[PDB]
Amino acid sequence: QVVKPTDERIIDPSTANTQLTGGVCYNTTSGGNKPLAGSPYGYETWIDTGGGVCSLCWYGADQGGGAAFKATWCNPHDFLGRLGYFWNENKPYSHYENIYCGFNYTRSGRKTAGDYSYIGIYGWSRNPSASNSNERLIEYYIVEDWFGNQWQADTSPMGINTTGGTVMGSFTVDGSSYQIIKNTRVNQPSIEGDKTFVQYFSIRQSPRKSGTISITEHFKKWEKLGMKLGDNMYECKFLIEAGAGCGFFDARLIQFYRADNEGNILQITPLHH
């Protein structure tokens, strides 16, 4: 019994399908979070100079819910483009209350993003007091959609053969079941250098290109399964990741907002006939 917000500044994602223009584009690796002018958000790009042309283009503070962007890649070697909240102020997820993201995008078709790919919500968290040192750094994904590959349709949810790890459980939210997976990344690149850390995934069983993500509901369910996030959330951004391929992602809407359990808006973007 968390009340879903009904505030009229919330844009209905189902009909938010007007092509945006006037993007500001970034074609190289950003080197972490970069803040956006007149916006609460920041972007990050990871673009391999050894691959082909990639970009992320932000649609600005006054349209598309304020976090909308278009991304492109061609022969990338794991392109990541992402935009949303950057935190990293020593607070657990629960400090940020009930986080929601409304979205609506187009993208290139099946098998245009390599053998693995991810679309949805992404970030990191820190939990230094965790007794298992593997669990002191967390990378997370809520996966609404992907590009499939030669072997599996983009209409079929990815599994542990793509993510690695172990199915911990599942639940239903925002109109679909989600499979919850935990994976350990052993001596791999992170935001703290090469080390061992864990990854939490929620995989939407019915992939989709528009709707609302009740982000905090994922965080709550992960923690019930022993998948703890700790006390210093790094960020919470909308992501497209392409392992390879040549394609695009083009959002007409990405709108983050936060509300308390009564459903009152604490933060929303944007902001007479």
Q: Which of 18, 87, 68 is nearest to 234 (CA)?
A: 87
Other CB atoms closer than 10 Å to residue 273's CB: what's the count? 1
- The answer to whether residues 59 and 105 touch, using CB atoms and an 8 Å cutoff, is no
- The answer to whether residues 128 and 138 touch, using CB atoms and an 8 Å cutoff, is no
CB half-sphere exposure, 220, CA atoms < 13 A: 14
Collapse the DSSP code of 162 into the 3-class scheme (helix H, G, I; strand E, B; otherwise coil) and give the result: helix
160 backbone dihedrals φ, ψ, rounded to 5°: -60, -20
Structural domain boundaries, residue 138: 1-273
What is the enclosing helix (H) or strand (E) of 219?
helix 215-224
Q: Which of 172, 157, 230, 225 is nearest to 197 (CA)?
A: 230
**Which residues lie across from 86 on neighbouring strands?**
235
Catalytic residues: 139, 241
Provide the experimental method for this PDB entry: X-ray
**Which residues lie across from 242 on neighbouring strands?**
79, 117
Q: How many domains does the chain have?
A: 1
Resolution (in Å) of the shown entry? 1.9
Q: Which of 26, 23, 9 is nearest to 251 (CA)?
A: 23
14: tokens are 């189902």
- The answer to whether residues 22 and 41 touch, using CB atoms and an 8 Å cutoff, is no
- The answer to whether residues 269 and 39 touch, using CB atoms and an 8 Å cutoff, is yes
| E strand intervals along the chain | 24-26, 34-35, 41-46, 55-58, 69-74, 79-86, 98-107, 117-126, 137-145, 166-173, 176-188, 195-204, 210-214, 232-233, 235-242, 246-259, 265-268
- The answer to whether residues 119 and 250 touch, using CB atoms and an 8 Å cutoff, is no
Q: Which of 89, 27, 99, 114 is nearest to 67 (CA)?
A: 99
d(CA 249, CA 81): 10
216: tokens are 């905090």
Alpha-carbon distance values, 236 to 7, 33, 177, 256 (Å): 22, 11, 21, 10
Q: Which residue has the tokens 């007794």?
A: 131
